[PDB]
A = this chain, B = another copy of it.
Amino acid sequence: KTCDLVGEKGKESEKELALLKRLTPLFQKSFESTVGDMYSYVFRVCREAGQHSSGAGLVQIQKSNGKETVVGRFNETQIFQGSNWIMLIYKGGDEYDNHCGREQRRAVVMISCNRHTLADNFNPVSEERGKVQDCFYLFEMDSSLACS
Q: Which residues of A contact B (CB under 8 A)?
A: 5-8, 11-16, 78, 80, 82-85, 110, 112, 125-126, 128, 130-134, 138, 140
Contacts and interface: CB of A to CB of B under 8 A. Distances in A.
A131 B85 contact: no
Given A82-B110, A82-B138, 12 more contacts: A5-B131, A6-B133, A7-B131, A7-B132, A7-B133, A8-B132, A13-B128, A15-B130, A78-B134, A80-B128, A82-B140, A85-B110
B138 A80 contact: yes
24 contacts: A5-B131, A6-B131, A6-B132, A6-B133, A6-B134, A7-B132, A7-B133, A8-B132, A11-B132, A12-B131, A13-B128, A13-B131, A15-B126, A15-B128, A16-B128, A16-B131, A78-B134, A80-B128, A82-B110, A82-B125, A82-B138, A82-B140, A83-B125, A83-B140
A130 B82 contact: no
A120 B12 CA distance: 34
A126 B74 CA distance: 24
A133 B140 CA distance: 25
Contacts of A82: 110, 125, 138, 140
B130 A13 contact: yes
